[PDB]
Amino acid sequence: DWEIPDGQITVGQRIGSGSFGTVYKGKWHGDVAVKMLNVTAPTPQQLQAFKNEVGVLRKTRHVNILLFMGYSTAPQLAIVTQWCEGSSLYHHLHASFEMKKLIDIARQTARGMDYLHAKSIIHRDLKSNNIFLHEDNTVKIGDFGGSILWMAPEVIRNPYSFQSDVYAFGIVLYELMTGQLPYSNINNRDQIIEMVGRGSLSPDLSKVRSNCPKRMKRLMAECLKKKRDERPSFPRILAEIEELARE
């Protein structure tokens, strides 16, 4: 069992919030990250609901997948993981790399994503802010345990699939290769939701830089396919990036 008894974790600085819960930095045999679930008091039925989600995190052992370390039931429900120094991929790309590094970041993410799907785990919300650059070198994918820019057309209108995860990866590719989010010119949610859902809108690939491996863009566009079944699986995506990487 991976339950961490009450009192063992010293919760510190509040880092940020989300629909799910609040993230703090903590102390448990060194630095940890504690996600306080937005649940004052847990019902026995909520308790099982929690265990089921932990049982899914329980089967993630990979260097590119955020390290799940433990879970709390008291005081309140919480997920304990490793502490990632630096910032999210979002903060680097948009808030504050060499083309080689960009590929590496893109490469590690595929490793993590392929591992997850091999474990038959659909992230369901892959985006640059759920990708943490620990030490600014290693990629840590979390929050698989709002943002519509990474949502596949079939998701907007078995909606959630490995293939919709692939699309979210394509957008991530777009972030890396352009250094900016899709539909930046169009700052209207309902507009993007309406236009991408019907197939009239797609990321502008004229933004990618010349110094972008044009083996990538083919792959990017392959993952950004409007049609679900026209997308390559992650094994393919991994092999591809790995093969176009050797250079």
Ligand SMILES: CCCS(=O)(=O)Nc1ccc(F)c(C(=O)c2c[nH]c3ncc(-c4ccc(Cl)cc4)cc23)c1F
């Ligand atoms: C392992 C899978 C468990 S999950 O429930 O699916 N995901 C899951 C579960 C618990 C979490 F605490 C977190 C999480 O958020 C973080 C874990 N370590 C971190 N280190 C730094 C930052 C950070 C620091 C500073 C800025 Cl500015 C931004 C982020 C954020 C986190 C998480 F993503």
